[PDB]
Each structure stands twice: as C-alpha cells, then as structure tokens.
Design a binder for these strands. Structure first.
Ligand SMILES: [K+]
Ligand SMILES: [K+]
Ligand SMILES: [Mg+2]
Ligand SMILES: [Mg+2]
Ligand SMILES: [Mg+2]
Ligand SMILES: [Mg+2]
Ligand SMILES: [Mg+2]
Ligand SMILES: [Mg+2]
Ligand SMILES: [Mg+2]
Ligand SMILES: [Mg+2]
Ligand SMILES: [Mg+2]
Ligand SMILES: [Mg+2]
Ligand SMILES: [Mg+2]
Ligand SMILES: [Mg+2]
Ligand SMILES: [Mg+2]
Ligand SMILES: [Mg+2]
Ligand SMILES: [Mg+2]
Ligand SMILES: [Mg+2]
Ligand SMILES: [Mg+2]
Ligand SMILES: [Mg+2]
Ligand SMILES: [Mg+2]
Ligand SMILES: [Mg+2]
Ligand SMILES: [Mg+2]
Ligand SMILES: [Mg+2]
Ligand SMILES: [Mg+2]
Ligand SMILES: [Mg+2]
Ligand SMILES: [Mg+2]
Ligand SMILES: [Mg+2]
Ligand SMILES: [Mg+2]
Ligand SMILES: [Mg+2]
Ligand SMILES: [Mg+2]
Ligand SMILES: [Mg+2]
Ligand SMILES: [Mg+2]
Ligand SMILES: [Mg+2]
Ligand SMILES: [Mg+2]
Ligand SMILES: [Mg+2]
Ligand SMILES: [Mg+2]
Ligand SMILES: [Mg+2]
Ligand SMILES: [Mg+2]
Ligand SMILES: [Mg+2]
Ligand SMILES: [Mg+2]
Ligand SMILES: [Mg+2]
Ligand SMILES: [Mg+2]
Ligand SMILES: [Mg+2]
Ligand SMILES: [Mg+2]
Ligand SMILES: [Mg+2]
Ligand SMILES: [Mg+2]
Ligand SMILES: [Mg+2]
Ligand SMILES: [Mg+2]
Ligand SMILES: [Mg+2]
Ligand SMILES: [Mg+2]
Ligand SMILES: [Mg+2]
Ligand SMILES: [Mg+2]
Ligand SMILES: [Mg+2]
Ligand SMILES: [Mg+2]
Ligand SMILES: [Mg+2]
Ligand SMILES: [Mg+2]
Ligand SMILES: [Mg+2]
Ligand SMILES: [Mg+2]
Ligand SMILES: [Mg+2]
Ligand SMILES: [Mg+2]
Ligand SMILES: [Mg+2]
Ligand SMILES: [Mg+2]
Ligand SMILES: [Mg+2]
Ligand SMILES: [Mg+2]
Ligand SMILES: [Mg+2]
Ligand SMILES: [Mg+2]
Ligand SMILES: [Mg+2]
Ligand SMILES: [Mg+2]
Ligand SMILES: [Mg+2]
Ligand SMILES: [Mg+2]
Ligand SMILES: [Mg+2]
Ligand SMILES: [Mg+2]
Ligand SMILES: [Mg+2]
Ligand SMILES: [Mg+2]
Ligand SMILES: [Mg+2]
Ligand SMILES: [Mg+2]
Ligand SMILES: [Mg+2]
Ligand SMILES: [Mg+2]
Ligand SMILES: [Mg+2]
Lengths: 386, 154
RNA sequence: AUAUUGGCGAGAGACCGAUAGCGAACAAGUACAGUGAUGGAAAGAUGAAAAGAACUUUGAAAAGAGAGUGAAAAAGUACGUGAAAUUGUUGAAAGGGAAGGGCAUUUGAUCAGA
RNA sequence: GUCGAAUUUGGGUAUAGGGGCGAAAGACUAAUCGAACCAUCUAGUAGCUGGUUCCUGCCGAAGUUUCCCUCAGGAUAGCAG
RNA sequence: AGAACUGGCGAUGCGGGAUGAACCGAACGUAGAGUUAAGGUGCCGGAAUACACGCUCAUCAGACACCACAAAAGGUGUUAG
RNA sequence: GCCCUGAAAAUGGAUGGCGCUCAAGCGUGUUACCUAUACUCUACCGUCAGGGUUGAUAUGAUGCCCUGACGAGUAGGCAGGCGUGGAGGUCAGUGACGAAGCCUAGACCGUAAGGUCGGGUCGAACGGCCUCUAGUGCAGAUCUUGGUGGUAGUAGCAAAUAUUCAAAUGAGAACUUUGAAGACUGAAGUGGGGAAAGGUUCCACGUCAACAGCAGUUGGACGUGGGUUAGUCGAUCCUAAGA
RNA sequence: GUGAACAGCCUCUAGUUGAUAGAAUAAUGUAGAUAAGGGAAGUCGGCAAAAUAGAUCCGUAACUUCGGGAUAAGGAUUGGC
RNA sequence: AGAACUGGUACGGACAAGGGGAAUCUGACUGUCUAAUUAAAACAUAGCAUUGCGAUGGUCAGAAAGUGAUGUUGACGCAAU
RNA sequence: CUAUCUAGCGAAACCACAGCCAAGGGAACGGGCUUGGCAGAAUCAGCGGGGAAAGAAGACCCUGUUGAGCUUGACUCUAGU
RNA sequence: GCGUUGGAUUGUUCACCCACUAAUAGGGAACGUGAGCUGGGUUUAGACCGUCGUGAGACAGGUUAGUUUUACCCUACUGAU
RNA sequence: UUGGCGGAAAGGCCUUGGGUGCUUGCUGGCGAAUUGCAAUGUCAUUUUGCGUGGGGAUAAAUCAUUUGUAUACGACUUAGA
C-alpha cells in the first residue's frame, strides 16, 4: 500500500556514497572555462582553515527593508600563505578523456614539498629529484625539449604548486602539493608563465580580490560511524520502541527482496569531499600588514588574530582570505579556493562590501575585549602585573 | 615416534612433540603455521616478539570475525593475533628440539623448522548452564603439537 | 502317567557374539535420578611373558629426544586390529557470485596388455 | 498495594486422585491439573502421516461399474502378471 | 464446475514450441553411416544477409498455432478495388 | 490490406537476446540446406518364436548351430542372477614363509548386483564349488545408539560503587601470604550465634592431573591424618492437634 | 551522628575487598540525567517522565451515613549566630 | 514562643519526601484468587431473605460395621441456598 | 556498563546442497531451470529487505465412523433413598 | 521532476469537521513494512450486561484485564580493510 | 648513417649517403638419392631461469613510538637519526 502521507526524502542521493574521502585534500574536479583572451593567472589557491569570527558592515541592497544599515555576519578566515610553483603539467585531449602528456618540475625543491614524497622522512636519504636536478646540468636541454613538447601538445596546462606550511602555526611541516589550471590564452605563454615561475612564490593577491565570489573545496570534518538519525535526519522512533529507537523502522518492502541504495543506513558521517559555491570574500588581508583586523572606521592597531589566538589553530601571520559564512572542513585543514565557474550577476555578487568592524575578541570563551590594551583600560591595575 | 609425513633426513633432523597440551587447537595451528619453514633462531625471535606484542601471528584459516591489526601487513593479511599460550607452548617445543639437536650434534646455526603440525587432541569436557534450565558442553580443544628441525643443505 | 520363564545339579544348540545376547560377559540391579512409589545406565581385548622402558640429556614439571625390553612400541596400561564422519602436515591440481555430473577430446600424471 | 488482625510465618498434624481442597481462577494438589505421579494391561487401536534395505531381463495398469454409517476406506466387476 | 468420443500426461524419455506434464513431430537396447519429421537457415545457432512478386515507416512499428490478450469507432497515411 | 489514434499500473526487461526498415517485418510462391533415442542398412547385447543337430570319439542336447521379429515405462507381477550370518558334503581347498579385516584418482573380468589381482598395514583364522537355512543387503522413517563438524575461536564471560603499591613464596603471581593505602557491608550488616538441611565441607600437613566457565603457588578441590569430652545444655519424661 | 524514626546517608566493633581482566570511548543499546520557546499539538490512552512533597502557622468547598471529605483546595515561613 | 544581627533572598539547601480539582460507570468498605500473560466491576464480607431439622432428626460420610462429621452441638443451634 | 580490539576461556540455534539480480514459464511470488544482465582472492563493524529465516507434526477451519471436560427427561444403567 | 499538511472524535481503513496551504490527487510494492516498533481492535484462558437456551453454553451484540521470543549465519544495503 | 614528420594508443612513417650479401634480367658447370610409396616431419612467437662478457645507478615501505585535522579495529593524517 501507499505511504499514506507524502514527505520529502531524507538526505540527498547526489552526495553518495557517504564514504571517507580518499585524501585529506579535496580534489578540484572542475576548473573555470578557459577564455583565451585573458592574461595567464591561477584559477585556484591553497590555504588552511584557521577559524571563524564576526564583522559589521553596511548592507548595500537596494529594495531591501533594511538597506544602507549595519549587519553582523559570520565569516570564516583561511590562512593562505603564498604557494610556490615547482612544476608544470600538460594535458592533451584524447577520445578517452584528458591525459597527462608529461610533467616538468623545478630544479630545486624545498624539503617542505619533498616531505610529501616520503612516508618516513626522518630515516630517508632524501634522494628525491637528485637525478632530475641533474637535467639542468648545463642548459637543461632535456628540460627545454620537455617544455617544447608541452607547447606543441597538451591543450591544458596545470602548474604544480605547494603550500608554504612552515609559515603556518601547524605542526604538519609537510606541504600539500596540488595542480592548478592556468587560464588565459596562448598556451605557449602558459608554459612561459610556469617556466618563469619555477621556484617562485605566487601570492593570494594575484588570484583573489575583494568582493569576489569563490568556491570552497575541502574535506568535511569527520565524525566516525554514525546512526541513521543524525547521518540522514530520519525521524526518531517513539520512546516505546523495543531494541532501540535511533533507527529507521522500515528499511524496505518485501519486494524487491533487497535493501535498496536509497534507504538511510548507519555508517560513516563526514570527512566527505564538498564543493560549496558562491562564498564572497570580505578580506584579502596581508600578513606583513600590521593592523590586519582594522577597518577604515576603526583604525585600531590590531591584527586579524583573535585575543589569545584562533582556537585550535594559532596566530595568523600570513595572507588570509575571509569568506562570508562557513566553508567545508574544520580548523587546521587544507582547503583550496577556486574561481567561480560562471559569471554571477544577481546583486548578491557585484555588491561591494566595506567592513566597519572586525571581531577580535577571544574565541576561547565569552570574549569581552578586542585587544590587550582594552583589557587594561577596562580593569585597570592588577596584582600580578599592569 | 611416528611423527607426521616428513621428507627430510632423519640423520640431519631433530624432533620434539607435546601431546594432550591444554591449549587452543586453532590458535596453536596458526602459531605453528606462522613459523613453519623458518630458521630456528629467527622463529624463536619472532615468537618472542609476538609475546612482546611487537609482531603478530597471521590467522589464515581460523580467523572469521576475529579482528584487524596493522602488524599483518608484512604477511599480506589484515587478521592477525597474539596467541600467547600457543606461542609459549611452541617455544617450549622449539627449545626441546634445540636441545635434542645439540645432543645429536647438529649445527644450530643451520637449523630450520623442517616440519611442524598441530592436530586436535581428545577434548576435555565441562558443562555450562543456559537459560530455562539447560546444560551445554563447555569443552576445551587441546592440541597434539609436533615439529622436526633439520640442518639446511644444498 | 500330567504342569513347571522359581530353587539346586547337569548335558546340549544350523541361537547371539559386547549398539548383539538377560538391563547387567566388568566391584549390575551397580553408579546415578526422583520425596516417594519406582526409573536405571555406560563399561570386555597391551603383550607368550611386564620383560610396564634401567640409564643419558632437555624441561619447574607433565613430558620430549636418545637408549632399552619386546617377534613386533605400525603393541607404551590414552595399549589386539584400527574404517568413516571430521582435522593437521606434505605433495599434486583447479578456482571472475556455488560445487558436484554426462557425451567427446586436448593436456599433465600413472598403468596393464603383444 | 498492604502493613496490628479476614496479618505473616516456622515446626508438628489432618484431608489422596473422579479423590482432597478451593473468600471460586477449573485455581492448587512436589516445574505435572478441565482429573497428579509410578508400574502393569500394552508392542492398546488407528480407514490417518512417515519409512520400508541388491542388480538385470520380460510383461505391464488404474483412478472406471455396483454396493457399503460410503465420500481419505473397503468389497465387487474391469485393466495387468 | 460438470458430461460424450478419441488421443495423451499421469507412467514418457528424445527433436521442436527460448522457458512449460498435456501442443507439434516422434515414442527409447548399445553404436556407425545415410535420409528426414516438426521446427528453422543474420549472429547467439548447425543451416541461403537464397531466389521472386508486392505491402508497411509506426514520436508505444511488426515478427509464428496451443500462448501468454486487445475491441467498437475513426484517418486525403499509403495500396489495391 | 499494412500502418496510426483508440491503447492507463505500479522492482528494470523482454519477437528468447542482440538486433533487424526494397528487413532479419507481413502475404505468397520455388528450391537448396540443418538435424530426433524417428525412418533404411549393417555390427553387437538380450528376449521371443520357428527350426537343424546323439550316426559316433562330441566331457556343457538345460549343449552347439541356423533363421526371423522385437526391445519405452511409474503402481505391480514373474524370471535369471549378485551379496551376508550360520549348516551338510566336497576341494586329502588357503594360511604364522602371514588367515581375516582395513587402506589403496593401481590392474583385470561382468551391462549390473559384484568378483579377482598387485602394494601397504595387520595378526589367527578363512574360502571356491553342490545344496540347506535366515534376526540376509539402507539414504532417508523430525528413525535408535555413539561419534563428528560448519556455525566458531563466534555469541559471550557487562547486576551486587574498587581497587592500588611493595615485599615474600614460587618455574610461573592482577588473583596466594604479609605490610601500606583507598573503600564497602554501616548493628533489619557482607558482624556474632543458632533451628531445618548438609555430613567432615571444621583443623593441620603435603600438594595442583581434573573442578573453582580468566588464572592460581590458593580453596568448601586432591592425598594423609587430627578433631565433637556434660548428673546441671537438649533428646530422654509429659501431654497438645493427632496417631 | 543527622534525623519523628530499625526511613535514607556517614562513621565505631566485627567482617570483606569476593564477582575474568587490559586498552580505547564508533554506531545501536541498558541504566541515570539535562535541555532554549511552546506545553499533550505525541499517543488508543499523559504510557514514560516531570511537577508536589518534611515541619510550623493561616485557611479549607460540594456532598455526607454527621463519623468524614481533609494533608481538600489555596497560601506564608524555615539557615547560622 | 518571641526578638536582634547576619548572608549572592539562601535555608525540609544532601538524603528524605502527597500532584491537585470537577465528574461519569462500577463494587459499599477492610480482605481473597488465576504460583508462571487476566487483581478486576470477579470472589469473600457484615446486612437481608428463604429452606430443612426437636435427635427414633436435618445435611453429609463409610464397601460394611456394636462405624462416623456437624456434635464437648440443640432452633439466639446446625445444615442448604 | 556494554557493544569494539586484545590475553585467557569458550558454547548454542540452525544446516538437502548452498547463496547476485530482472523477466519468462513453472505447484499460478526461483538461489538453481530458460533468456538476458553480469561477474575478480581474502575480509571487518553495523544493519534488519530477503533466505515464503528459526522456534512447534496449526491451537483457527474440515475430516476421522479418534477422544476428553461439562450439561440435559439423548440411549442404557447405577450408588443412595 | 517536484510537493501533496497540522489537528478534534473513533482501535479503526474509511468517515466527518476545524484550519493552513500552491495543493492538501488516487494507488502498488506478499491488501509494502510486528526477529522495525506499538498492541488501541480482532482473536485463547478471568469478568459484567442484553437476547437466545431447561442446561452446559452461543452471539459480524456491547464492555473491562489480558507475556509480541531469537540474528553471531548467507545474501542485500551502509560504511571499512 | 643524415635530417624531417608523427601525442588519439605517438613507439611508427618518410628521407641523404655509403658498405656488405643475394639478385631468376640472361647464359653455364657442379651437388641432391637410402626420410626406402605418405606420415606437421619439427623452420613460428611467448614468457621464465641460468652461465659467460660489456654498459649503467647505489632506496624505500611496513611494524614499533608519536600525532589527532582521524578512528570500532583496520585505515587516514602527522612527527622523530
Ligand atoms: K461429548
Ligand atoms: K478434559
Ligand atoms: Mg502519495
Ligand atoms: Mg545538519
Ligand atoms: Mg516494549
Ligand atoms: Mg569560543
Ligand atoms: Mg564475517
Ligand atoms: Mg549460563
Ligand atoms: Mg534451574
Ligand atoms: Mg549389552
Ligand atoms: Mg577395543
Ligand atoms: Mg605387528
Ligand atoms: Mg589399536
Ligand atoms: Mg578421513
Ligand atoms: Mg567475491
Ligand atoms: Mg566439465
Ligand atoms: Mg471458565
Ligand atoms: Mg507395531
Ligand atoms: Mg511394453
Ligand atoms: Mg493421503
Ligand atoms: Mg499417481
Ligand atoms: Mg514461447
Ligand atoms: Mg494433429
Ligand atoms: Mg551457423
Ligand atoms: Mg478497423
Ligand atoms: Mg496499433
Ligand atoms: Mg531468425
Ligand atoms: Mg516472406
Ligand atoms: Mg539406434
Ligand atoms: Mg522394458
Ligand atoms: Mg544369524
Ligand atoms: Mg592378509
Ligand atoms: Mg579413497
Ligand atoms: Mg593372537
Ligand atoms: Mg533385519
Ligand atoms: Mg545410515
Ligand atoms: Mg530410500
Ligand atoms: Mg536424524
Ligand atoms: Mg545424535
Ligand atoms: Mg566475544
Ligand atoms: Mg551480558
Ligand atoms: Mg560489579
Ligand atoms: Mg581482582
Ligand atoms: Mg591483602
Ligand atoms: Mg559506609
Ligand atoms: Mg578449611
Ligand atoms: Mg578456569
Ligand atoms: Mg589452571
Ligand atoms: Mg580434604
Ligand atoms: Mg535440662
Ligand atoms: Mg534528636
Ligand atoms: Mg524545554
Ligand atoms: Mg522553559
Ligand atoms: Mg502552562
Ligand atoms: Mg491528541
Ligand atoms: Mg494525532
Ligand atoms: Mg505514570
Ligand atoms: Mg497542602
Ligand atoms: Mg474530593
Ligand atoms: Mg471492592
Ligand atoms: Mg488498614
Ligand atoms: Mg498470573
Ligand atoms: Mg497480574
Ligand atoms: Mg528473480
Ligand atoms: Mg508469473
Ligand atoms: Mg531457496
Ligand atoms: Mg545464465
Ligand atoms: Mg540486528
Ligand atoms: Mg531478513
Ligand atoms: Mg498437522
Ligand atoms: Mg497438532
Ligand atoms: Mg466414514
Ligand atoms: Mg470408539
Ligand atoms: Mg466420549
Ligand atoms: Mg500486509
Ligand atoms: Mg518484517
Ligand atoms: Mg514481532
Ligand atoms: Mg488489547
Ligand atoms: Mg433464561
Ligand atoms: Mg562481534
């Protein structure tokens, strides 16, 4: 017989399987469509989620009941140190998909990126790329021919870049290596861009701008084995239920005489690769620029780092991208931010935010003070110091 | 006397056995198969590491729904255990075989486990009490263990 | 003269041969169960003779490896022989969600016949 | 729920099976109650269910007639050896 | 659900109807050779992508009896009267 | 006539599938081709029938030979044979120089029931033939007894707040002893005694093969012993319901 | 000792430290709880849970067999010195 | 019993410990049973009513008895409803 | 506290053989058959769709010329009176 | 393709009404789904009433109380080696 | 050996120059037998090992400890000369 009461399905079948991602770094499965008139530029960047805070900004939304007055908005801050270009990968179009023709790496690789190629760095002999570095003996004749093949072929060109993770407070110490597609015309210039940029750093200012809508690709926070009630949002069974109530009552009809893929069942929740789109950047702040967390209306000399440091992450000392709302992944986790795959014109994009105030109070509690100066000015003299 | 089927030289071999030993037959079989064919000293070191929980005995036949461990990767398995009782019994039999080989005058540095087999001894029977006034068996599965160590040749 | 599944003493069998024959070939109406009336098993075989393994060695020991007794230890009191189910070791072979089978032949192994 | 009197309970004693006992439920009567348990009659009967142990060769059916307190059965004639 | 005649299944394998107790063909010792039955000759699959005259284009075409369905009524679709 | 509308059902699926469009569709005609345990011929097996052949040495006339036809089959009937326990006769049968039995992807005979041989193991009896006899053949009976599996080293060994350190003993100590600490029963006790019941569980010594669902050096276990002292405590005496 | 109290809790004498343990802390469970706003809209049904609770003082209805209802309901207070 | 002072207005501070009200059906109440699915409105109860019987009897036992229960009883009793 | 892993210990239910589906037919709902889809060792924790899962020779219905408990001027008797 | 509700009564499916809503469409999947729950109903044994029956008892007549057992196996699915 | 082209799976294609061998384009000499009248009458390519020489380079992973961006256990993420 019929369900007797219609209700929307619990969970989304397009996010299957709900398994652990194969890597702690989420894969960028699509890059922006290449427009061969624009200059050569990175279409993505590599950063690490530091934490969240709040801001105040005037809402610029004509037609809204609440236009031109102040809104408090949550923002996620991602530490984004400049990425070092260490390679170049070419992809030629084949009737079976894209295929990597060849990859040309930089002459000298830092131990940070070399650590990625070892599971046991402490006892290794660090022989990686030592014969490859000999390819640059006198003129790099093999290298220039290898790049020439990329120009003659390889309709898609990607640079191999790695995070400068020793600049982050993370104890990881091992960089994350990823391929970023080079958009912009004249593929030959793409290889010229990559070859010129070997061993060179690329800053987040050259990828992202204020007010830009970007895509967050990250592996969500893992939660281990989870019951159906929280994994899918299924209704809790009554208290009277025997053998437990945090279950799905009917997992299938008699026929088909099988459990169907569409039935919510217990398993791993989280640690999934997600690509969340249309998150607006509110800040592209600079690590060397003291008073990061200040705005044109505050001017107070305070960095973006909250009082006592970002909880579970540490202090931010590099370039950071502040996005509106939240992004997949937890603190300290590698995240990749890419360009929007389309041109969004809906007055939520193209809306030019100007921050009025940034919350720098401690996230380690019910923070009362933005800066240590304010704490002294409020409480006055203490017995320990001050 | 009259051990299992062996294809090694009795003049270059030394045997030891233990009968009606109250140790789990399945665990003892897995322990014996873990060192079957190994050198004597290497097998003894491996058994000491197993006792120390540094290495594990891969469970190949009697392994259904036992559990997974990372020490099985060197044996190409996910299911390995640390059957300390079986390891101790096999260590006793190994030192017995080493003593017999020394008595016969065999090269202890060339000794390898040429043969080892565990089979089921007669079961020692107890009783367990079950709901609604029922009685079920609670039998042990003891082992007859035998091994022969031979000098390696060419 | 006739009866006699009891008692005693005998002689026999085209009877049974230890799951059979009386329940009981054996410390059997015994062990054991039930309050009780009653119910009621399982259980024979080393070897001619213990000649039942002196002694050496390893182990805390049980025992093991030697040695030895014995016609035989492929007879070690867990003992005449010693199947099958089931199990270990070695050897051989096959194996994409059963396996097993028939017709015919390949291949490998093995083999009788002139 | 009841908890100072139709209270609870130990020991001794009385009531024994178509019997006892029952402030009554066919309840209890030694885990057995709309007739306890044990032994015997008893290898009780069953038109009903299940099983029914070696090979080969030859021949080879019937579910139809009549009757039966007969309709899951039998006798009778027919088919078959 | 119940009768009549016959043939079958039950009791029967084999070839065909993919698959099936009943249909078609044909009933069977062990084999060889040849020819066929019913059924088929694009491949699965052994056998002509054979010959010949025509019809049909279906935005749910059609494709071997038993058999696994389709009707009344309509169409300047197309063909022959 | 073909095609289309009429023509809507629930897991995804059925000219059998692929697929097929002057078809590999439909109507019709002509050939060639494919193959059943069918048909024709032959070989062999058996059955039935008709015969020939005591003119011998010819020992199997229930024998040998010729000819023709046939062979499906449940329930069921009959016939010819295989096998087992025991019995009469016979083989002046086999066997401790190895009987029976058992194992043997080793060989031979029979359509088959089965029979024979080779090898290993084993140790004391056994077999062919003619005939007699039956407690004479197993795959089933939720068959009986006994043994054995997969399940499976799995379920589980989770109530009673709780154990920890050191030393000693010991081969071996989470569990034994001692000491220290932390706790609990909190006098309607996890205390001290008793009635019913049990019967040596009491205590000491030695001691761990089995039990104490882990362990164990410990024990209500194992082996050997020791221990229950009444004129006054009870029975004994009295009677109660009752016998 | 607290306490009306042989209630619950703690302690003294006495006794025990006996329940197989070790490591992590997934789901779902068993037992114990909490939860913003709403307050039975859940459900057959307020099932389960919560709320009230001791003592002192004030006050206490319908009905009534005049005995009760009644701790009706509804209220206020409670420590230490 | 009263007063003063005192405090994060807390104070039966742990433990401990009624939820209450308006009614309807039903049994008066206390009590009793289906041990091991039914605790109830079921049974029992005091009250009420009926019946039998004056012992050579009523009711009920026993196979029978020179045998019994009520009855160590006597209608304000026993027995059956 | 489990569940999980480990050290030790260590069962039971159940088991024709076993285990991937769709359709067909079939004893009219197949794991095996037919046509297709497909299909790669060995596994762990959950889970409750399926195995028309397990637990019991259906207790409901019918049959049996099978009972038993109980009732009545069924039939035939009988203790007592 | 995507939605198709919150409630009063009633075990109910169904029905009816209140109200929101864009709408409150109809159904299958062993009349999907009890080793997923619950047990309100039906549908054991206790009990009351009405009718019927002399009676034991009967009622698609009403009412009250009334044990919902097992996964650790294979597959399927969710995850994990 | 020179140079160029080919990336869809290029792994191949085209080309300059010379050396060596055959050359059936034509004309000669020598040999075949006995594999007994046929027997595929062994001529191909596909891996692997081994020995002799020459050329070439001189690491990681897992366990264990640790981490916690992870987690039932595996696994994942880390760090440690
Ligand atoms: K009757
Ligand atoms: K009865
Ligand atoms: Mg619907
Ligand atoms: Mg959420
Ligand atoms: Mg429940
Ligand atoms: Mg905070
Ligand atoms: Mg498993
Ligand atoms: Mg138990
Ligand atoms: Mg018991
Ligand atoms: Mg006997
Ligand atoms: Mg014997
Ligand atoms: Mg012998
Ligand atoms: Mg023997
Ligand atoms: Mg065997
Ligand atoms: Mg598989
Ligand atoms: Mg085959
Ligand atoms: Mg009744
Ligand atoms: Mg009989
Ligand atoms: Mg015939
Ligand atoms: Mg029948
Ligand atoms: Mg029949
Ligand atoms: Mg068909
Ligand atoms: Mg016809
Ligand atoms: Mg063909
Ligand atoms: Mg028409
Ligand atoms: Mg049509
Ligand atoms: Mg065809
Ligand atoms: Mg045609
Ligand atoms: Mg033939
Ligand atoms: Mg025949
Ligand atoms: Mg006999
Ligand atoms: Mg012999
Ligand atoms: Mg065999
Ligand atoms: Mg003898
Ligand atoms: Mg017999
Ligand atoms: Mg049998
Ligand atoms: Mg049979
Ligand atoms: Mg059986
Ligand atoms: Mg049995
Ligand atoms: Mg377990
Ligand atoms: Mg438990
Ligand atoms: Mg406890
Ligand atoms: Mg302990
Ligand atoms: Mg102590
Ligand atoms: Mg205490
Ligand atoms: Mg003692
Ligand atoms: Mg134990
Ligand atoms: Mg022990
Ligand atoms: Mg003693
Ligand atoms: Mg006295
Ligand atoms: Mg006081
Ligand atoms: Mg709340
Ligand atoms: Mg609130
Ligand atoms: Mg309220
Ligand atoms: Mg409601
Ligand atoms: Mg509701
Ligand atoms: Mg309640
Ligand atoms: Mg009050
Ligand atoms: Mg009141
Ligand atoms: Mg009452
Ligand atoms: Mg009272
Ligand atoms: Mg009860
Ligand atoms: Mg009750
Ligand atoms: Mg199917
Ligand atoms: Mg069908
Ligand atoms: Mg099946
Ligand atoms: Mg198939
Ligand atoms: Mg489960
Ligand atoms: Mg299931
Ligand atoms: Mg039945
Ligand atoms: Mg029955
Ligand atoms: Mg009849
Ligand atoms: Mg009768
Ligand atoms: Mg009767
Ligand atoms: Mg249903
Ligand atoms: Mg179900
Ligand atoms: Mg259920
Ligand atoms: Mg109910
Ligand atoms: Mg009446
Ligand atoms: Mg488990």
């Amino acid at each position: 017989s019929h369900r007797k009461y219609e209700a929307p399905r619990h969970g989304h079948l397009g996010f299957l399987p709900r398994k652990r991602a194969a890597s702690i770094r989420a894969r960028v499965k699509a890059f922006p469509k290449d427009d061969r008139s624009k200059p050569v530029a990175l279409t993505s960047f590599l950063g690490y989620k530091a934490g969240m805070t709040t801001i105040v900004r005037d809402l610029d939304r004509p037609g809204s009941k609440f236009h031109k007055r102040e809104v408090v908005e949550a923002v996620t801050v991602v530490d984004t140190p400049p990425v070092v270009v260490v390679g170049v990968v070419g992809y030629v179009e084949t009737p079976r998909g894209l295929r990597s023709l060849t990859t040309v790496w930089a002459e000298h690789l830092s131990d940070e990126v070399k650590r990625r190629f070892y599971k046991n760095w402490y006892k290794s002999k660090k022989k990686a790329f030592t014969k490859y570095s000999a390819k640059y003996a006198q003129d790099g004749a093999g290298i220039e021919r290898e790049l020439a093949r990329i120009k003659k072929y390889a309709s898609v060109v990607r640079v191999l870049v790695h995070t400068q993770i020793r600049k982050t407070p993370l104890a990881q110490k091992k960089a994350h290596l990823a391929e970023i597609q080079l958009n912009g015309g004249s593929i030959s210039e793409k290889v010229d861009w990559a070859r010129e940029h070997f061993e060179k750093t690329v800053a987040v200012d050259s990828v992202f701008e204020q007010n830009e809508m970007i895509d967050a690709i990250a592996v969500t926070k893992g939660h281990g084995f989870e019951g159906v009630t929280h994994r899918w949002g299924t209704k809790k069974l009554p208290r009277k239920t025997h053998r437990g109530l945090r279950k799905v009552a009917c997992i299938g009809a008699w026929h088909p005489a099988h459990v169907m893929w569409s039935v919510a069942r217990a398993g791993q929740r989280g640690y999934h690769s997600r690509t969340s789109i249309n998150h607006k950047i509110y800040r592209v702040g600079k690590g060397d620029d003291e008073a990061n967390g200040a705005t044109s209306f505050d001017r107070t000399k305070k960095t973006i780092t909250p009082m006592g440091g970002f909880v579970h992450y540490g202090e931010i000392k590099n370039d950071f991208i502040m996005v509106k709302g939240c992004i997949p992944g937890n603190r300290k986790r590698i995240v990749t931010l890419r360009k929007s795959l389309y041109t969004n014109t809906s007055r939520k994009a193209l809306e030019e935010v100007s921050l009025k105030w940034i919350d720098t109070a401690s996230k380690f509690g019910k923070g009362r003070f933005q800066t240590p100066a304010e704490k002294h000015a409020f409480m006055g003299t203490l017995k320990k110091d001050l | 006397a009259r051990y299992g089927a062996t294809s090694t030289n009795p003049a270059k071999s030394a045997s030891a056995r233990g009968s009606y030993l109250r140790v789990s037959f399945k665990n003892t079989r897995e322990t014996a198969q873990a060192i079957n064919g190994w050198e004597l000293t290497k097998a003894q070191k491996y058994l000491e590491q197993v006792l120390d929980h540094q290495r594990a005995i891969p469970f190949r036949r009697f392994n259904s729904s036992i559990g997974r461990t990372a020490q099985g990767k060197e044996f190409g398995v996910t299911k390995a255990r640390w059957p300390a009782k079986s390891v101790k019994f096999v260590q006793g039999l190994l030192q017995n075989a080493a003593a017999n080989a020394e008595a016969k005058g065999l090269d202890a540095t060339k000794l390898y486990v040429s043969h080892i087999q565990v089979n089921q001894a007669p079961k020692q029977r107890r009783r367990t009490y079950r709901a609604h006034g029922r009685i079920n068996k609670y039998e042990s599965s003891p082992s007859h263990i035998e091994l022969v160590v031979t000098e390696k040749e060419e």
